[PDB]
């Protein structure tokens, strides 16, 4: 636990980016300036009870306005379905991870407020209230159950567990042995306050939004077709769109087999657009084939169709490269110089003469074997 | 692109299902915006001129005609379903249900074989055609 706390401290220290220069706008003061808000003064217990009631009402509004009347939210903020529901209603019963996190936070806040009320109702002693707060903060992931709603909170849960372990193992020494009377809850309170402050913008954005009022080939083909069709007149878009698509397909198959695409009866801008689309598709296909070959060589998980397509593309690329290399060899002539070739031939002739290798004649008309 | 004419009206799609009886009618309920439905449309275009003599494939937009996605409950981004002479044949893919394909089948040969098997089963009248594929797994390794 101490090592984990040190890790958390070192992480919060190494990432200590200095704060940015804000315009210093106070949201609370802004809402106070708004005519739709009043101001008063009341005890923290009464305000907590009012906030719990308001949160329950808000959850009821969010789970009732959506016509999902097949579920009920308990007074402990644990929403349980009323009865069975169909797949359509199951999709209608979809509770977002933001909604689940908000429900868990509201449940924790309501539990804390009710514990404070019980402390102020004479149900338990003040030391018992401190122990209850320590329980409601440390080892509260089981009670709150917010880990499933947002997995990232598990780090905060582990930090609270480490703080609880440290506080226990420090306080519970001497005459005070192991027991439930540990009421030192400031650390867990601080951790959960920080977690709530971090979580608040996301949940607020979700709630505000609720209440309002790899494929380069196909994409490029669709874009080219859309551009050609929009350029094409209505008198020619009735049936010649298929002809333009066929011309584009012929251009694509032409560049993939070193066969020139020659459409002398086509408009020059149309030919330019087709050539640009072909070049873009060739670049995308080459990049995709190189990436797939690299993944296959590394040992990535592929299928039979993907392997077949990658093998075909690689074979076509290799054939094109070999054709280009042969054309360059013809253009650049024989790589081996005449002097070097003559020297090599002289050396081979000398070696053969030293070995006295009788040449293998043409197969006679009456060869024994 | 999407050369397959999408039946915009729901009643028009239903009449199209009642239009042809001697072939296979496949309706692509996927929304044309998503890339998965784009891949499904590409696969259909691969078999557009092949299974044409034995099938009639139409596209569909769940946003245009919502009744198909609310009665048949096609919640998948791009679900391929079949209907033969007012009888929605079931393909024994093995994915728990048989109402839809629900997978972006990138293999043209697999789609052609599935279409042929569906046609054979519809001719035999089997409401649950045994798909000659192990669709229950990813079929990749």
């Amino acid at each position: 636990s101490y090592q984990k706390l040190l890790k958390y401290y070192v992480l919060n220290a190494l990432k200590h980016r200095p704060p940015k220069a804000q315009k210093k706008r106070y949201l609370f003061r802004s809402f106070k300036a708004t005519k739709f808000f009043q101001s008063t003064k009341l005890d923290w217990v009464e305000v907590g009870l009012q906030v719990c009631r308001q949160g329950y009402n808000m959850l009821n509004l969010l789970i009732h306005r959506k016509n999902l009347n097949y579920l009920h939210l308990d007074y402990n903020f644990n929403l349980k379905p009323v009865k069975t529901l169909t797949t359509k209603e199951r999709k209608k019963s979809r509770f977002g991870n933001a909604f689940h996190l908000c429900r868990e936070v509201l449940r924790l806040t309501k539990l804390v407020v009710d514990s404070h009320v019980q402390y102020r109702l004479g149900n338990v002693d003040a030391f018992q209230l401190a122990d209850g707060l320590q329980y409601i903060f440390a080892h509260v992931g089981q009670l709150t159950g917010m880990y499933r709603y947002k997995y990232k909170l598990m780090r905060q849960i582990r930090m609270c567990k480490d703080l609880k372990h440290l506080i226990y193992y420090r306080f519970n020494t001497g005459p005070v042995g192991k027991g439930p009377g540990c009421g030192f809850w400031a650390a867990g309170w601080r951790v959960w306050l920080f977690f709530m402050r971090g979580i608040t913008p996301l949940l607020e954005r979700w709630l505000g939004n609720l209440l309002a009022r790899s494929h380069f080939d196909l994409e490029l083909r669709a874009a080219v077709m859309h551009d050609i069709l929009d350029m094409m007149p209505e008198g020619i878009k009735q049936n010649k769109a298929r002809t333009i698509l066929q011309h584009l397909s012929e251009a694509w198959r032409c560049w993939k087999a070193n066969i020139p695409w020659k459409v002398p009866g086509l408009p020059t801008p149309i030919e330019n657009m087709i050539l640009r689309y072909v070049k873009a598709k060739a670049d995308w296909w080459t990049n995709t084939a190189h990436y797939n070959r690299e993944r296959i060589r590394r040992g990535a998980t592929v299928d039979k169709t993907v392997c077949k397509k990658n093998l075909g593309r690689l074979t076509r690329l290799y054939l094109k490269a070999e054709q280009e290399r042969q054309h360059n060899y013809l253009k650049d002539g024989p790589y081996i110089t005449a002097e070097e070739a003559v020297a090599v031939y002289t050396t081979t002739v000398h070696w053969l003469e030293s070995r006295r290798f009788s040449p293998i004649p043409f197969p006679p008309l009456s060869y024994k074997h | 692109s999407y050369m397959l004419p999408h039946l915009h009206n729901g009643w028009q799609v239903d009449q199209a299902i009642l239009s042809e009886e001697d072939r296979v009618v496949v309706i692509r309920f996927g929304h044309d915006w998503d890339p998965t439905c784009m891949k499904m449309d590409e696969v259909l275009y691969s078999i557009a001129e092949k299974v044409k003599n034995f099938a009639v494939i139409y596209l569909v937009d769940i946003t245009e005609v919502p009744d198909f996605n609310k009665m048949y409950e096609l919640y998948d981004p791009c679900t391929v379903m079949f209907f033969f002479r007012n009888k929605h044949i079931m393909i024994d893919l093995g994915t728990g249900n048989n109402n839809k394909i629900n997978w972006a089948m990138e293999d043209k040969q697999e789609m052609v074989d599935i279409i042929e098997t569906v046609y054979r089963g519809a001719r035999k009248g089997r409401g649950l055609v045994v798909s000659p594929k192990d669709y229950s797994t990813k079929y990749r390794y």
């Binding site: 859309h226 069709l229 929009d230 878009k237 769109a241 | 999407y2």
Partner: peptide
């Protein structure tokens, strides 16, 4: 025909 549908699909993507 297909031009209008293709343009509509392209404009949303």
């Amino acid at each position: 025909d297909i031009e209008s549908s293709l343009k509509q699909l392209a404009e949303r993507r």
